[PDB]
Structures are given as C-alpha cells and as structure tokens.
Amino acid sequence: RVGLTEEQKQEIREAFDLFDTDGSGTIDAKELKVAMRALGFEPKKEEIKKMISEIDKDGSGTIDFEEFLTMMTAKMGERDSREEILKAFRLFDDDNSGTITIKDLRRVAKELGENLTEEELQEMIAEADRNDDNEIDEDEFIRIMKKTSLF
Amino acid sequence: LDELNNMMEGIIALAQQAPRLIFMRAFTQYFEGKPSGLNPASVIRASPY
Amino acid sequence: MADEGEVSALVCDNGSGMVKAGFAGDDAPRAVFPSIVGRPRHTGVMVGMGQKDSYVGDEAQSKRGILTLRYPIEHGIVTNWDDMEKIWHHTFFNELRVAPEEHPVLLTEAPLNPKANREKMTQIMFETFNVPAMYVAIQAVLSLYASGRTTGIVLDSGDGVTHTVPIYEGYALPHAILRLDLAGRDLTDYLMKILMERGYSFTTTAEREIVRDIKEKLCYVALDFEQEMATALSSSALEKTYELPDGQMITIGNERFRCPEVLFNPNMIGMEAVGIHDTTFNSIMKCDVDIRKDLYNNIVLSGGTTMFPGIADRMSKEITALAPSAMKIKVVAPPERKYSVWIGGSILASLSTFQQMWIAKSEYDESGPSIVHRKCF
Amino acid sequence: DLISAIGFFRNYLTGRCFRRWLKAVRQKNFNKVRSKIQDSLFLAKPTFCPHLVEIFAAVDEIRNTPFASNNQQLYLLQDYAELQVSTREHKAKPALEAIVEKVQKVLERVCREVQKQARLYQNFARVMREVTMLGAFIRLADYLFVEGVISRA
Numbered sequence A: 001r002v003g004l005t006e007e008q009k010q011e012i013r014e015a016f017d018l019f020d021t022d023g024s025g026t027i028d029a030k031e032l033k034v035a036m037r038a039l040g041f042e043p044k045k046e047e048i049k050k051m052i053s054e055i056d057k058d059g060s061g062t063i064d065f066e067e068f069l070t071m072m073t074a075k076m077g078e079r080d081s082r083e084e085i086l087k088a089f090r091l092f093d094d095d096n097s098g099t100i101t102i103k104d105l106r107r108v109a110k111e112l113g114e115n116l117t118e119e120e121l122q123e124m125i126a127e128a129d130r131n132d133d134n135e136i137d138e139d140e141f142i143r144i145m146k147k148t149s150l151f
Numbered sequence B: 001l002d003e004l005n006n007m008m009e010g011i012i013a014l015a016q017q018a019p020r021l022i023f024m025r026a027f028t029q030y031f032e033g034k035p036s037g038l039n040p041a042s043v044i045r046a047s048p049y
Numbered sequence C: 001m002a003d004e005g006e007v008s009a010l011v012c013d014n015g016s017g018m019v020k021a022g023f024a025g026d027d028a029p030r031a032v033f034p035s036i037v038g039r040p041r042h043t044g045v046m047v048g049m050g051q052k053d054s055y056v057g058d059e060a061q062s063k064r065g066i067l068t069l070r071y072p073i074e075h076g077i078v079t080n081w082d083d084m085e086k087i088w089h090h091t092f093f094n095e096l097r098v099a100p101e102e103h104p105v106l107l108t109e110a111p112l113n114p115k116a117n118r119e120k121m122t123q124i125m126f127e128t129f130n131v132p133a134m135y136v137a138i139q140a141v142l143s144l145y146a147s148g149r150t151t152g153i154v155l156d157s158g159d160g161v162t163h164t165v166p167i168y169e170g171y172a173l174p175h176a177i178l179r180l181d182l183a184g185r186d187l188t189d190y191l192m193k194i195l196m197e198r199g200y201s202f203t204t205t206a207e208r209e210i211v212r213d214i215k216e217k218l219c220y221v222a223l224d225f226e227q228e229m230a231t232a233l234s235s236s237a238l239e240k241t242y243e244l245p246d247g248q249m250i251t252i253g254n255e256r257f258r259c260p261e262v263l264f265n266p267n268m269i270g271m272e273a274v275g276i277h278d279t280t281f282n283s284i285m286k287c288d289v290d291i292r293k294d295l296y297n298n299i300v301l302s303g304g305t306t307m308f309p310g311i312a313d314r315m316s317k318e319i320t321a322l323a324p325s326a327m328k329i330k331v332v333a334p335p336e337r338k339y340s341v342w343i344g345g346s347i348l349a350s351l352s353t354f355q356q357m358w359i360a361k362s363e364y365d366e367s368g369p370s371i372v373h374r375k376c377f
Numbered sequence D: 001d002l003i004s005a006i007g008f009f010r011n012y013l014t015g016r017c018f019r020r021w022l023k024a025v026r027q028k029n030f031n032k033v034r035s036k037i038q039d040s041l042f043l044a045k046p047t048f049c050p051h052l053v054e055i056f057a058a059v060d061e062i063r064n065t066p067f068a069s070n071n072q073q074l075y076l077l078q079d080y081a082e083l084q085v086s087t088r089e090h091k092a093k094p095a096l097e098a099i100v101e102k103v104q105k106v107l108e109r110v111c112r113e114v115q116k117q118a119r120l121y122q123n124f125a126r127v128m129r130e131v132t133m134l135g136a137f138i139r140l141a142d143y144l145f146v147e148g149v150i151s152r153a
Helices: A006-017 A027-037 A045-055 A065-077 A080-094 A100-108 A116-128 A139-149 B003-016 B040-046 C081-092 C115-129 C139-145 C184-194 C205-218 C226-234 C255-261 C276-286 C293-297 C312-322 C340-349 C361-374 D012-039 D049-061 D077-089 D093-120 D122-151
Strands: C010-014 C019-021 C031-033 C037-040 C065-069 C103-109 C133-140 C154-155 C162-165 C178-180 C240-242 C250-252 C298-301
Touching: A006 A065, A027 A045, A027 A065, A045 A065, A045 C133, A080 A139, A080 C361, A080 D012, A100 D012, A116 D012, A139 D012, B003 B040, B003 D122, B040 D122, C010 C081, C010 C139, C010 C340, C019 C340, C081 C154, C081 C240, C103 C115, C103 C139, C103 C340, C103 D122, C115 C361, C133 C139, C133 C340, C139 C154, C139 C298, C139 C340, C162 C205, C162 C276, C178 C276, C184 C205, C205 C240, C205 C250, C226 C255, C250 C312, C250 D077, C255 D049, C276 C293, C276 C312, C298 C340, C340 D012, D049 D093, D049 D122, D093 D122
Parallel strands: C010 C103, C103 C133, C154 C298
Antiparallel strands: C010 C019, C019 C031, C037 C065, C154 C162, C162 C178, C240 C250
8 A cells, every 4th residue: 555645646646637638637548558658567458447447436437636546546555566577677777787786776765756874775785685795686686576575 | 856856767767677688588699699779768868858 | 562463552752842653563653743732822813724622743833823832741741631632632533543442552751750640641541532551651761672772871852851861670760860851942942042143033933943953954062062162263164054945044153063062061051950961970870880880881862852963972972071981881872863762662562472561441440540550660 | 758757657666666675674673673672671571571560569558658657746745756656667567578578479489480490491591591680680679669668768
C-alpha cells in the first residue's frame, strides 16, 4: 500500500491532465495503457480491462481522476513483476554496468525527491552486498529484490 | 526543641537500623562482602530539604 | 506489543514542544506533532475557521497566529491535563485515528514528575477513552532504550525540558536526577532576542519557527567559548549572514554559537541554573561514587534540543573539566537524538516478555490511578 | 512523449524497489538494536520480570509508615514523648521486619530457582547469565528499597 505524497500527487494530477484539453476529462483505457507504457510495464489488454473494471465504482470505463488515482494507488501497493523489475534495474544503473556504488545509491535516492545520508549508503552496501565492493551487480540486486519482495 | 530532636531522631533511627539485605547470611556471599551504594540516613541528611 | 498477536502499544513521546505518538515496531512515530494545545481565540471572529474544543499538533499550528496556543507541557512538567484528553482525543481519532481501546497506551514522562501528574493521566485515560491496558514510561529511560543502553546517565532535552538522569543497572535514581528547564526553547528565545541586535525583524510566531529551524541547523555549540569570542570579534568569518527566501537577510556574529553555548554558560541570558554539563556533573555525584565510573562514561544526548551540530566535543570536555580525569566520559549523540524517546518506547513496547507488565482495565477500576505505583520502577 | 520523462514515472519502480531495500535495512537495524538492548534488561528475562512486578506491588508498604505521631495533638513534654515514641516504633518496626522478611524470601526463591536449575544443567546461556546477575538484581532491589525508605523519612 503505497501512499501518495505531495510530490507524487502533483505529478499524477498533471499526468491525468496531460490527456484531455478538449474538455472530456474522462481519460480512457488506451490512455492508461500509455501511462504504464511510460511506466515501462508489460502492458497487455488483460491488465487494462481487469483493473479498470474492478476500479470502476459504477462501470464508467472513461475513468475520471478519482477512480484513476484510486486504481494507481492500488497498483503501486500491489506486487511488482519481473520484466519491469529488470527494466527498472537498467533504469537504476547510470551506466548500465549492472552495479550500484555508494554514490550511485545516493543519486538513486535523490532521483525520487528523497535526499539521504552516507551512513544509509554504507549500511545498504554492507547488508545487500557479498564483498562490500560498492558494486551491486546483477545477482546481489536480484537477491535484495527477493528479500524486499518477500514482505 | 530537644523533644522534637528526640522524635526526629526516632524517625531517622528507625529508618536507619532496619536489617539491611546486604547484611544477611544469604546475600553477602553473592557479592564480595559489603557492596557500595547508598545509606538511608546518609541520603536522608544529604537531601538538604 | 508491536505486532497484532498482542496489540501494539500506543507509543507517545510526550515532549515539551513536540509530541511523537505512534506504534511499537515502527521507527518513525505515526503522529508527530508539537506539544502545544491550540484553542479557539474567539467564537464570533473565526466563523468558518473550524471552531473545536482544541486544535492539536499541526492542527494547533493550522491557525498558528489566531489561536490561544495553550501549552500543556512546559519544560517537561505538564501544566494541564484537560489538554492531554484533548491531545488524546485528537490523537486516537484525528492523528492515529484508531480507537484507543484497540491498543495499550505508552506515554513518556519527564523525570522528577509528581505523583498526581501520572495518576491524572490514568484517571482521565480510562474514563474517557477506556483503554483495557497501558503503561507510562520515562522520557530519559526510553532515550537510553533507543541508544541500546540500560545503565548510565541520559541527557534528554526537548524544547524546554532537560533532565540529567543517571541510571544504574536499569534504575534511574530520583535522588540523583537533576531537573533543568534550560533547553532549546530558551536558546531559541535568546536567538529570537539577539536578532534584534543586528536590526532584523523577529517578533511573530512565524518568525519563532524560522529561527527555531535556523538554530537546529546553524547554531553549533562553542567548544571553548573564549576563542569564539576572539574569532568572531577579530574576524567576520563567524559574523555570518544567512539568507531567508521571505526577504530578510539576517546577520549573526558571535550570535551563532552564543545561542547554544547557554547549555554551558547559562549566565549570558541571565539564567543562574547550572548548565547541562554542570547539571550532569552534579547529578551523577549524587549517586554512589563507584557507579559514577560508567555513569559519566555513558552520556547519551536526546530530545529536540539535541539537534545541535558540534555538541559532543563540548559535552565531553566540559564534563572532563568537571568529572575526574581518570574517570571516563562517554558522550554519545546518535542521529536518533530527537526520536530516541519514541524509538526506545517502541523498542521497549516491542519486547515479547513486556506483554504482562501492562495494567489491566479492571486493575485501575479497583485500585484507582495509583495502580501505576504497583507497576512502576 | 509528454509523459515519458515525468519524474515519478521515471522513478516508479526505481523508487519503489529501492525504498523496499531501504525499509528492509531500517527494519533490520531496528531489530538488531532492539535485540542487543533486550539482552540488557531485567524485563526480558522471565525469571526476573514477574517477581520484579511482585516486588513493585509489595514495596508499597514503605509509603504507609509514619515514623512519628504526625499530629498536632495537645501533648505535654512527656505526653509528646510517649505518643511520639509509640508512633515512632510500635507502628513502624513491624513494617521494617515484614518488608525485610518478604524481600529476603523473594530473593531467596529467585536465587534457589536459578542455582538449582544450574545444578540440574540456547536457554543454557540465559540461565547461566541469570545466575551471574543474581547479585546485580539483589543490589538494585536493595537500592530501590533504601531510596523508598529515605523518601519516607
């Protein structure tokens, strides 16, 4: 259950607005598919139809901001999937070397609107790494993904 | 004044000569004889109030 | 407890200027809010502004200017208990938003607190909110609990409270604990006043908070107050001017370190109470002489006042100048030095064996609020 | 294209998974701190906590001991003498002996339990630790009691 801060509320409000200047307002299934295409999931018809059907409080289809926001709040709190996990690890890597350093973890934190400290980075390295190399390669990263997906 | 002193002396004395735990047969041997700490009348009169 | 096998304790850091309420097992208290009780200034002037019994916390700071901000807790000692019942009412229904009877209550008390203070919480809490169990802990004891220690002095200092609390083998010695109202509130009030000295407007509650945060970042304690007088007067490096986006370019010279030095030279603001280093030194000397070896060598800093850069060095040297040189001085200022009260409270409440120490509802109904004495330490 | 470089959509899984890693490390930090202080406290030990609560309930007799006739009665010098002596001793010395007896009984029970379990001998280290800090428990209880006596006087 991922709650939305002010940063993400503003970003999602602007994103929902990014669909309709024509005044319709009620964004659609294909536009939500475009939203998770920007999110880099594996967007197929089943996800679109099932999620919109189960979040439509009456069967609107052309989802408004309220139920759209509720649906994406449910999606964020829901379980992740491996193909976009790998795509997002490529996002993680600044050089696509498959590794994360102390400074790489710091910049990853700051990408989120979350400014952090060094002690956090050393403790992350010591915990999730097997030789404290400041290089979180593929197997270490997938290992920490298992540990943090077994919540 | 001296009888007030006598009654306060009774207060302090009966707060002081209770049989302390650190004196009995089954508890001194757990430490090395007499432990260090606080004495009833000592702290009673150390509190300036 | 912390999980839901036995319901998690309502861990509430009842500070002097900031109250942190939450649940055990967590590290960040879910209800972080100041220790003020805002009440409506009037009735016929704020129609539509949400008249209530009392605004609480950030809601107490919602109308931060046009509310009768009544202080329940001043320097640790709680001045009114109808405030807490309104604090609690806004806690379990507007801050934690969970029915109080669901979970036991954990409250933090300033050391050297009179008996009627604790009993009134027990009296009010059961009659209005009717929890089935709770337990009231000490602010400094939980601060040591977050620091991972159970033996040694705790210097917990919120907004106004400051208690040097020597603890041996788990017991805080009330004969030795020294009360001190000198804390960051007085220092911020000094920084409030000494910004007049450079010609910069600071008189409102909005300016009260801006200066407070400035103190928490910039006001670093002077390790040896004499040379900072020399450097600030022989150079402009300490005569720094800090920018605020509100349109007030404020200059502080020796003013920077003068604000936090009062913890060690109280006499500049007129305060004649012994400084926190002297308060620590005198307090431990009230204990047994031998246990002072690890008491002076356990100094842990906690509370809102402890958001002070460069504090550990001044703590150790001043205590070293007071305490015997051979006797060790372990001044510790962990990053939890503001959340230590709640973190340790969550840590203590998360103990599995700690799940029979709570006072049952029937126990209060029979023995009254004095049931705390039957389960105090 | 408009939604391709939005900050939150670029950061969606990066932030969510990195935050999962972050919170996992925070919670294990909390776990180790909690454990390494839990093995530093009397409350954790099941041999120590319940008898400690019993001591809490039993010591409350110190508070109810008037060491003198704390009344403004119309005494004489001698009348003051006998009534103040009576309230000094006859209604206090029994309380002293009773509290001494109950404390010695409770601590003897604790010591006998731990030492007989040691003679009978994971939990082995815990029992050995309790046997070791028997003395610390006794001393702390005694200092609590002396503090109470000082406050009462």
